[PDB]
Ligand binder design. Structure first.
Ligand code: BCL
Ligand code: BCL
Ligand code: BCL
Ligand code: HEM
Ligand SMILES: CC(C)=CCC/C(C)=C/C=C/C(C)=C/C=C/C(C)=C/C=C/C=C(C)/C=C/C=C(C)/C=C/C1=C(C)CCCC1(C)C
Ligand SMILES: CC(C)=CCC\C(C)=C/C=C\C(C)=C\C=C\C(C)=C\C=C\C=C(C)\C=C\C=C(C)\C=C\C1=C(C)CCCC1(C)C
Ligand SMILES: CC(C)=CCC\C(C)=C/C=C\C(C)=C\C=C\C(C)=C\C=C\C=C(C)\C=C\C=C(C)\C=C\C1=C(C)CCCC1(C)C
Ligand SMILES: [Mn+2]
Lengths: 295, 35, 50, 306, 407, 56, 39, 36, 43, 50, 36, 38, 49, 50, 36, 36, 50, 50
């Protein structure tokens, strides 16, 4: 909310590409807005990107061809379980710690940037309230669970293939994450969000002819376009949701996925749940296992 | 012309100080919090 | 209407901003004064430097 | 507005006057519903001149395809309940989670079972569920031509139906056995989804699975951002009415894809990921049986040898 | 029915063209690759026969030894070796220097050796023998063969005949040689080309089941950050069981690779463990559900529920894998005793084996130790292993596999 | 019963059943609320707007 | 008019793809391999 | 002059720095006074 | 200029480009198949 | 305008696409000649067709 | 009529099919002019 | 005199550099020509 | 408004024609230098024979 | 508005940004000498370079 | 602004820095030429 | 107006290049100055 | 405006852009000549090519 | 709005943008000498090219 800039924080002049209008997309790349918070976010993100890329590059002994070849499988490891929450020497966890701190600062600065910019323009800051869910998931996974168990070693490594490896490792270590009451709810909300986006986007694209994509003008005054969507869904399944209600559904279905699932990640530790399949056995939802070998 | 350049400057003065402090603290002998 | 603001920093300040800034100055300086005692107590309990 | 004369249009038109029919307070269900109840334009009323199915029994449009879907729903649900919840390991409340229906045995191959053999239930349930889903597809097609709309919702539901059809028909047909489907039952189907994919050595290293994961996550992110934008800007009444949304994103994300653009992008985001997931399932087991060592060709490429 | 019939005519035509082109493509596949694939597929899955090694013996260039031995490769050398064996068994019908194969006549020794010691290693008589005087041990290769004959008896009697659901397969001389005398491959191409080059820290399990975190209490090879492949090798050659399999409880049978229990390791060690299990899957040419159920990797199921993606023989395979993990740690422990020639430096160039099959054992010497892929080579049942049903009963079976090394 | 894997004072079966029941109940209630307030409502009190069209 | 332009592009794409795949299949065969035979 | 904005940003920076310093000092393996 | 209300003299030129190419395709493809199968035939 | 374009192909073409396609065709035929030379000279090195 | 875009697809198709043919020929053990 | 000589020219320069890059990288990856491996 | 070749009037103006000329001349400069490099590396170590 | 600022630095400045900006140099330098003293004491504690 | 030369120059300059970086890294990763 | 945006990109390039070789030199064990 | 530009490059270069092309052309040789000297120096350290 | 810039660079830029493009050149020249003196100390410490 310092906003720097020349003209209300915006530097430069708009750039217009008329080709994008043909496919249905807006033709202007606007003036760039530089504020305090987005400047901090950009600086911290650049530092994090530099640290990540350079620590990966040093592992292949600065070979560009080997860097390109092994870029996906290269990773930065967190501190080992021996150090707990302490600061290890570099190249064995210090690099991970510095990069994680700067990434957290970048995320918080971006949240402040969107909150401030929504307030400045007069609209309500509902984009930041929704970003709070992704922030919660990231915070839990990276800091809160590791700091709670006192091991940095349970946070994901800094690589493209490292995230997939961490997902598989966490699921395997804590017993078949499919038996997670919150990861089940998380899957419900995520798949429901994808389904919701599919139906809503398909409806609006179909009703493009009736100016149903002008949602701002149809919230206050529906018109024939909104009606030929409400009736479509009412005839399809027996209930509909006007322009305002459907966006509430979208926002809530998207946000709840972060919270229900941050809870799932948080509870997956020896203090609360160690075996999720044993949890399901105690819940009686498993198909019965069977006899042990005779021997 | 100069207000932006002051703020940007500053937030660099801060990020670089944080970076050097972390690198100094992570080094084994220079760790003053382990003894 | 900026009689309280000294002529020195007149254009950058008005009455209310100067009033807030005086409070901030006192707060930061007392903050440092308490810091001196805190770091003195810590150093006479667990010296990290020699 | 500046629509690039030297390239094909591909953009909407707004037909004649569907911009002035906007009442500033919203119409009730009483006036709206009789307006667009035209009697005709059905993917049956065109071929066969004059069809019925006691149309509209409440809020719902019955239709010929609705009748087909009702028949399929009744029979498939009967079979699925009768040998998932009725017959299972534990009590009926607990059988909901743990009940299962298993595919036919390998030596059946591609062929029907008998009324009582181990796999008849899977075959009948999948056939009747496919019929019900096809009926729902064509009912959605019918409702769209009722209101003079695009068929994008039927097309996306067809993409989902294509995922289901791949999984339960195409891969079993291509591999020569019905003993390649997936178990019916909420927790048994999760167990199957685990064991399949772990038997291919860490399904995470599937390229098309990664593309589908990206599509799913990006669709959820787009839904969150779009809902937040509309909810925040719904209450604004100032200088720029609708552009208050474009300028806000241009301050945040320095493109601000338009109002129609975001919906088109969401459509592509939702459908492409599921199409890639269909491709991943199709390629899983037929050409390749190991996904970790499938990347063995990456090491021997000409420009990477040292 | 206006002129818009054109689109449906187009659809029908494009469906017909798709049908005919797919049918013709599959006809071409049957005519060229389907035929070629099926002859090649028939070769795979067939057992190993003594003729396989005789062919490579007789269809190889003669070589000139530098250590004072005659050429042992080629049809002429094979011919004269067989003729000299005939002459020797004519001279002495009773053996005079056997120490492991006690109780065999000289004719059965000749017949057993010319098949299952010659084809097994793919070398002629001249490798270890002296043609003129057979019984004399002049080269270290014969001492190595003696000790390695002892290894067959020990390994069979200690691990193989003990296996639950044994199926009947013994280990002969060809099971890990696979018609190759020296420099055998311990890890396949999938392992070397599919394991990422990253550095990891591995925490071994203590006898009680807990982890050892401080480096000073760890084995020597893992006190420093190591590559993933080297940690896989350490786990393979340092495997122990701290919870012996008790059928009465389903959470038993946990060894050095156990993760999901009350004590437990962190998420990091799952990568190393899963890479070890990936190597095991690659060695046998099977998937992860060959022994495990993805719903929980701890169980020994016996009769699993979902059979389409699982192996019905789940628990027996899991227990066999445990026993052979113990076997390929016993081999590392006792390799110097069973006649293995120590290598000065790890061989490099043409003929070497992947640099991972060469290990520095206890007495600071480099050996070519066996691995999981050595005896398997992509098959869950080794194709160079002999089934007891394929062994004639009695006099003829003495030639095929000696009862002295049967266990 | 002695459940080893407890999330606070919550048995596994109670947590699963409560999660399912709460999700279904909430979904039904929100469906009813959304369908009721879709169109403008006409009664003797007045003409309530559709959902949020009177910026109040 | 009605569509014949889509058919022209689809037919060319199909012919090209089928020819490429059939060549690959022929090339993968031990007997018909022409750029790998030694004697 | 953005005196108010600078004041708020300065206070938030102080809070963030104090939190980070407390975390790093308490997590260090010499100063965690959990030995009582 | 064609008694064929489906094309027009324009798009019945484009089309015709495709209708030749096929005739040359057939001849050269038949020659290639004959030459190949004359050196290692089938059943 | 269409003065250069030959009279048969009036519908599709205009003047400049005729020139563009003509240079494309000439490039294609020169490419074919050079490729024929390369293929012939390669066939004398290691034949791939008996 | 699109002649200005069918020669862009023409050029890309020819370039891609040349890339693939050179790559396939270079991978053969008897046809490898670099590693020999 | 309007048509995209410039657009074709700027795409004709990127393609050559990309091709040369790749061509150089393959010959450097060959053990028998790699100059920086003596 | 262009003094370009009587043939290529429809597509070329002096500005674009001058641009096209520079890259034309640059391509043949590329050619001789590439021929020099190829000839030199062929004499250093033949690949194709 | 433009008198306290110079006779060269004038298209680039006015009174308020000249102050607001003159404060920064005094902070900069003063920090700088503090940092020099801190670096001297740290190097006295242990040298990192020979 | 009769030509885009004032922006093409920046593209060429950024082309220079990237090529210099790539060549520098390739030479630095050479076991023969490692100077650090 | 004349382009005067080079000054900003050029300062950023200087910072990035200086930070690059201040990291590469640290990675080298012999040229390290932060061990003892 | 275009005065000092060569007469042929009038449609393309006005004074502003041509005076920039001049300095870029000069620097190319100020980033030329130096690079050749550097390579010559590195060549007689260990030749990469025979 | 310029009356200090050299004659040849007048049409390009004014006093405002060339006054700070003397500050940047003074930074560059001096940043160079500090870099050179710093580099020589390291080159005496341990030569990196022999
Ligand atoms: C370190 C960067 C700090 C800063 C620290 C200093 C310091 C240190 C000094 C100046 C000084 C100067 N700075 Mg200052 N300066 C900052 C931001 C700016 C900005 C801007 C882009 O907003 C501008 C236009 C200026 C401009 C100037 C001139 C008014 C003055 C003479 C410089 C010179 O002639 O070099 C030749 N500063 C940021 C605030 N500035 C100098 C000065 O005013 O001398 C008394 C001086 O010593
Ligand atoms: C692979 C399919 C190719 C194609 C390849 C050919 C070929 C090859 C020929 C035609 C020919 C014909 N095609 Mg055609 N044709 C295509 C697409 C179309 C479409 C379409 C829906 O848009 C239409 C309406 C046509 C229609 C026709 C008529 C113009 C003509 C006479 C056919 C006949 O009498 O058959 C009766 C005979 C049996 N083609 C597609 C792209 N077409 C014929 C032609 O024009 O004669 C010169 C012929 O030689
Ligand atoms: C050891 C030397 C290498 C090799 C390494 C390179 C390198 C390096 C380059 C080329 C490049 C080129 N090489 Mg070569 N080149 C080799 C073998 C060949 C052979 C051949 C049939 O043997 C041919 C025809 C070519 C052809 C070519 C042209 C495509 C090109 C020069 C562009 C041009 O001529 O514009 C007129 N090379 C051998 C393998 N070649 C140059 C290029 O990129 O072209 C754009 C490039 O930088
Ligand atoms: C790639 C697929 C595989 C995966 C993901 C996998 C995963 C795992 C995991 C997570 C464990 C530890 C589980 C624990 O808590 O008990 C484990 C252990 C084990 N696995 Fe695997 N495994 C795989 C393949 C295999 C295969 C093919 C075999 C059999 C040949 C196998 C045999 C075993 C055995 C015996 C154990 C117990 C080891 C121990 O107790 O020390 N695994 N596996
Ligand atoms: C064995 C033996 C005998 C030896 C071992 C060898 C060894 C290991 C030693 C190595 C030593 C090294 C490498 C020392 C390096 C010192 C440096 C880089 C100092 C930089 C100072 C930079 C300084 C003071 C910069 C000051 C900048 C100022 C005052 C800038 C001011 C300004 C700014 C920023 C904005 C605009 C206004 C203004 C121009 C006034
Ligand atoms: C024994 C009898 C005894 C039968 C046995 C079994 C058998 C022989 C066959 C079964 C099936 C077939 C018929 C396979 C045929 C296949 C295909 C799909 C070919 C590729 C085609 C496309 C071809 C050749 C021509 C294609 C495309 C062109 C010319 C593109 C053209 C055009 C562009 C791009 C747009 C407009 C302008 C222009 C005309 C130049
Ligand atoms: C690798 C294996 C294993 C087999 C082989 C692999 C294969 C697939 C194909 C073989 C070959 C190919 C495709 C060679 C193709 C080469 C080309 C097209 C190069 C670019 C050239 C032109 C160049 C550099 C000249 C360009 C333009 C220049 C120099 C400057 C241009 C201009 C622009 C930017 C505008 C402003 C300034 C100016 C007007 C002067
Ligand atoms: Mn919308």
């Amino acid at each position: 909310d310092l906003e720097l800039g020349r003209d209300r924080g915006r530097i430069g002049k708009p750039i217009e590409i008329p080709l994008l209008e043909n496919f249905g997309f807006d033709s202007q790349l606007g003036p760039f807005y530089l504020g305090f918070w987005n400047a901090v976010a950009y600086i911290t993100g650049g530092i994090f990107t530099f640290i990540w890329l350079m620590v990966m590059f040093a592992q292949v002994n600065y070979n560009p061809v080997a860097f390109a070849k092994y870029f996906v499988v290269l990773q930065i490891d967190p501190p080992s379980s021996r150090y707990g929450l302490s600061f290890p020497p570099l190249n064995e966890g210090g690099w991970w710690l510095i990069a994680t701190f700067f990434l957290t600062v970048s995320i918080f600065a971006w949240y402040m940037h969107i909150y401030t910019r929504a307030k400045a323009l007069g609209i309500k800051p509902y984009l930041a309230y929704g970003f709070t869910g992704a922030i919660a998931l990231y915070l839990v996974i990276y800091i809160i669970r590791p700091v709670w168990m006192g091991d940095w070693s349970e946070a994901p490594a800094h690589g493209i293939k490292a995230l997939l490896d961490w997902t598989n490792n966490v699921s395997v270590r804590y017993g078949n994450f499919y038996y997670n009451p919150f990861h089940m709810l998380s899957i419900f909300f995520l798949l429901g969000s994808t389904l919701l986006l599919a139906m809503h986007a398909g409806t609006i694209w179909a009703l493009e002819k009736y100016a149903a994509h002008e949602e701002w003008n149809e919230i206050q005054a529906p018109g024939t376009g909104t009606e030929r969507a409400q009736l479509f869904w009412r005839w399809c399944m027996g209930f509909n949701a006007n322009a305002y209600s459907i966006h509430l559904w979208a926002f809530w279905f998207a946000w709840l996925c972060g919270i229900t699932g941050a809870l799932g990640v948080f509870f997956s530790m020896p203090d609360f749940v160690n075996n999720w399949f044993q949890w399901g056995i105690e819940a009686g939802i498993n198909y019965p296992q069977g006899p042990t070998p005779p021997v | 012309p100069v207000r932006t350049n002051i703020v940007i400057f500053t937030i660099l003065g801060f990020v670089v100080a944080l970076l050097i402090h972390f690198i100094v603290l992570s080094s084994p002998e220079y760790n003053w919090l382990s003894n | 209407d900026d009689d309280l603001v000294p002529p020195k920093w007149r254009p950058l300040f008005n009455n209310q901003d100067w009033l807030l800034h005086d409070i901030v100055v006192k707060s930061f300086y007392g903050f440092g004064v308490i810091a001196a005692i805190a770091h003195l107590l810590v150093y006479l309990w667990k010296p990290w430097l020699p | 507005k500046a629509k690039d004369p030297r390239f094909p249009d591909f953009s909407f038109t707004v037909v004649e006057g569907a911009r002035a029919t906007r009442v500033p307070g919203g119409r009730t269900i009483e006036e709206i519903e009789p307006e667009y109840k035209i009697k005709g334009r059905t993917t049956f009323s065109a071929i066969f001149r004059y069809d019925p199915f006691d149309f509209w029994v409440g809020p719902f449009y019955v239709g010929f395809w609705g009748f087909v879907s009702v028949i399929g729903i009744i029979f498939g649900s009967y079979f699925y309940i009768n040998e998932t919840i009725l017959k299972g390991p534990y009590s009926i409340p607990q059988n909901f989670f743990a009940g299962r229906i298993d595919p036919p045995p390998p030596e059946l191959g591609l062929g029907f079972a008998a009324p009582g053999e181990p796999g008849f239930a899977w075959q009948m349930t999948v056939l009747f569920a496919t019929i019900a889903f096809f009926g729902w597809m064509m009912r959605q097609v019918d409702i769209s031509m009722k209101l003079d709309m695009g068929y994008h919702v039927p097309i996306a539901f067809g993409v989902a139906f294509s995922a289901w059809l791949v999984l339960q028909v195409i891969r079993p047909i291509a591999l020569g056995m019905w003993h390649e489907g997936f178990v019916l039952g909420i927790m048994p189907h999760l167990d199957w989804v685990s064991n399949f994919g772990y038997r291919y050595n860490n399904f995470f290293y599937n390229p098309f699975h990664a593309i589908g994961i990206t599509g799913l996550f990006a669709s959820t992110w787009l839904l969150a951002c779009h809902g937040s934008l509309i909810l925040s800007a719904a209450q604004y009444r100032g200088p720029e009415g609708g552009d208050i949304e474009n300028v806000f994103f241009r301050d945040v994300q320095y493109y601000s894809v338009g109002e129609s653009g975001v919906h088109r992008l969401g459509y592509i985001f939702a459908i492409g990921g599921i199409l890639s997931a269909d491709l991943c399932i199709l390629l899983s087991g037929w050409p390749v049986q190991d996904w970790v060592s499938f990347w063995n060709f990456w090491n021997n490429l000409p420009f990477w040898s040292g | 029915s206006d002129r818009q019939l054109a689109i449906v005519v187009s659809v029908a035509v494009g469906i017909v063209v798709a049908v005919i082109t797919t049918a013709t493509f599959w006809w071409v596949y049957d005519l060229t690759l389907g035929r070629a694939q099926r002859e090649a597929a028939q070769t795979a899955g067939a057992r190993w026969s003594p003729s396989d090694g005789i062919k490579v013996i007789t269809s190889s260039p003669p070589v000139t030894p530098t250590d004072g031995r005659q050429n042992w490769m080629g049809t002429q050398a094979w011919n004269e070796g067989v003729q000299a064996g005939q002459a020797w068994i004519q001279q002495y019908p009773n053996t005079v220097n056997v120490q492991v194969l006690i109780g065999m006549s000289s004719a059965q020794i000749w017949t057993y050796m010319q098949q299952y010691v010659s084809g097994a290693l793919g070398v002629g008589c001249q490798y270890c023998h002296n043609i003129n005087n057979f019984a004399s041990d002049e080269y270290p290769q014969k001492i190595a063969a003696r000790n390695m004959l002892r290894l067959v008896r020990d390994v069979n009697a200690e691990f193989i005949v003990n296996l639950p659901n044994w199926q009947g397969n013994y280990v002969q001389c060809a099971t890990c040689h696979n018609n190759a005398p020296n420099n055998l491959e311990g890890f396949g191409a999938q392992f070397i080309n599919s394991v990422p080059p990253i550095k990891v820290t591995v925490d071994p399990l203590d006898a009680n089941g807990m982890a050892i975190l401080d480096p000073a209490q760890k084995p020597e090879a893992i006190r420093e950050p190591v590559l993933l492949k080297d940690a896989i090798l350490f786990y393979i050659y340092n495997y122990q069981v701290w919870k012996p399999f008790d059928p009465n409880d389903p959470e038993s049978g946990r060894g050095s690779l156990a993760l999901t229990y009350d004590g437990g390791r962190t998420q990091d060690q799952v990568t190393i463990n899963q890479n070890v299990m990936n190597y095991q899957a690659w060695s046998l040419g099977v998937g992860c559900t060959f022994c495990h159920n993805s719903r929980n990797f701890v169980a020994y199921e016996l009769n699993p529920a979902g059979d389409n993606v699982l192996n019905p023989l789940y628990a027996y395979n899991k227990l066999k894998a445990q026993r052979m993990l113990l076997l390929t740690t016993w081999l590392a422990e006792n390799w110097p005793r069973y006649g293995a020639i120590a290598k000065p430096e790890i061989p490099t160039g043409s003929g070497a084996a992947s640099r991972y099959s060469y290990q520095r054992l206890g007495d600071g010497q480099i050996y070519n130790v066996p691995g999981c892929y050595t005896c398997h080579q992509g098959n869950n049942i080794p194709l160079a292993s002999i089934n007891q049903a394929n062994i004639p009963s009695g006099d003829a079976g003495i030639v095929v596999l000696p009862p002295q090394i049967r266990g | 019963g002695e459940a080893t894997q407890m999330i606070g004072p919550l048995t596994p079966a109670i947590l699963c059943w409560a999660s399912l029941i709460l999700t279904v109940l909430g979904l039904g209630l929100t469906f009813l609320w959304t369908n009721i307030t879709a169109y403008a409502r006409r009664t003797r009190t007045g003409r309530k707007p559709t959902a949020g069209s009177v910026i109040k």
